[PDB]
Amino acid sequence: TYKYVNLREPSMDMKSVTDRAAQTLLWTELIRGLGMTLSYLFREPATINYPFEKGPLSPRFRGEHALRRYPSGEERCIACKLCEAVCPAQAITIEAEPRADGSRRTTRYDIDMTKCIYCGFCQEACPVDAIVEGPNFEFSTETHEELLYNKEKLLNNGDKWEAEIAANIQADYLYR
Amino acid sequence: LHHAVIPHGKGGRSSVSGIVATVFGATGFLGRYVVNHLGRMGSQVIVPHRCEPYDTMHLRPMGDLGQIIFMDWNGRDKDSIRRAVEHSSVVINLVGREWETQNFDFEDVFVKIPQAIAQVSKEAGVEKFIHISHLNADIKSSSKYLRSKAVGEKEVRETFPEATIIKPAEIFGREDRFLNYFANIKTVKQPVYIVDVTKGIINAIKDPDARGKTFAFVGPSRYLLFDLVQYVFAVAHRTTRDKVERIHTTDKILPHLPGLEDLGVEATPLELKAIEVLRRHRPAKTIP
């Protein structure tokens, strides 16, 4: 099924011809356009007062990465490298060895935040909710080097944001 | 060699040259070429600067991520000097000024500051020290600049006996105060190209023979000053009392000192690079 967007015959009766001459000489359709912009002048603007007001986001939002812990304080990550395998940008670098207590834990966990595409595949792949993308999006820096996160930075991000991260996961985990 | 400073790679931006250099005076004419050459081969460069960080931005792209480190420093604060050189294997002093100021005179920049850098570098265990003096340094010069260059040249050798002192003639290049100086306005000059001076400095770092030596970096040809100024005006298609005195000092001939040739550098003729410098402002017979 189709329709014509511009297949109309203008009437050639005198009344219709004089309607078009009036539009040509008196700029009626231009005046109409001025009416529309005038009405907007008197509308409330859509602008918000950033940084005092913020754009709305959802629990699923993919922001700055963080490494999480169990309630006891033990790290969740057990160096399985599923996140490193799936990462589409090869942004993750991991090394691991047996910890002094025998645990399977990483000795390196780097995310090059300038390689990362913020896709969230790592947190999908993680089997123990260890690597997540947090809600923070205001972490721009003055140097490139500050965006090459190592494990200490990511663990500090986890300890910094866990209060929000845990609530957001509580809100969305039944959709996963 | 500490394992972290063993050279690796192919000599490129991401390579490791094994050089950890603190470059005082890096934000100037000579410093931007020295830092660039160090960064080209993956050296760690410490850049202590007195100026606003905005004025150091041209140095940022010269090294791979993390290879250029900036620090604040004060000429008269030795603790700031120590922090900058503490981890370096070579210290390069390019500090200088072609005029005097209310806060810093020629004795400050060419004697007190170089001596302080050399002393703290020795106390910090720095292995190599590169100091830029001047070909026409002399304690009998009509120029206070060249007088101070001589006194500071002596104090650096006393403080850091293994220092490599380099004595260039007036340097010409895109950002010089030589060819640009003439294009903006008896004596014999032997000007030397900026890239040749830079290459010689880089080679003095890699060359164990250069330790304890004094070099004289001069161009290939000697020009009567009048012929040089006429040549500049032709190519261009066209100050202080001290600066005039320096410009009219004839370039000393010191055949006993080693030169660029001893460091493997081929002096660039002025005629080859004159257009490069002076193109934005739009052949002199030599003295055999």
């Binding site: - | 790679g9 000599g11 081969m41 193109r279």
Partner: protein, 114 residues
């Protein structure tokens, strides 16, 4: 050993195109130095043209020669029409590349590469 030709049916026909392309490049160099305000001389530019031609002097396949001329003409068109910029022209000279060691001892000192 029966193949579809590109342009030239034998080496003699192919060498005619090579000489015609060399003529065009040879005459273009002075204009290129002026248009791009290059710091190199015309002799340096013409020496570069000769070096690039010489490196392929050992070819004996007329089809390979045709492709080399096809590519050489494309490169010339980029230069004449000023689709290239100054950086593209100067990429033939590798000015910022430090000379790489040639003899066995020099290579041995600097790394493991042959």
């Amino acid at each position: 050993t029966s193949v579809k030709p590109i342009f030239s049916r034998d080496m003699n026909e192919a060498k005619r195109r090579v000489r015609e392309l060399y003529r065009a490049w040879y005459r273009e160099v002075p204009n290129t130095v002026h248009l791009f305000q290059l710091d190199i001389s015309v002799k340096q530019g013409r020496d570069k043209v000769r070096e690039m031609f010489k490196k392929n002097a050992h070819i004996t396949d007329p089809r390979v020669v045709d492709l080399l001329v096809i590519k050489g003409k494309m490169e010339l068109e980029e230069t004449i029409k000023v689709w290239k910029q100054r950086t593209h022209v100067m990429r033939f000279f590798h000015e910022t590349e430090a000379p790489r060691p040639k003899d066995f001892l020099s290579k041995f000192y600097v790394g493991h590469d042959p």
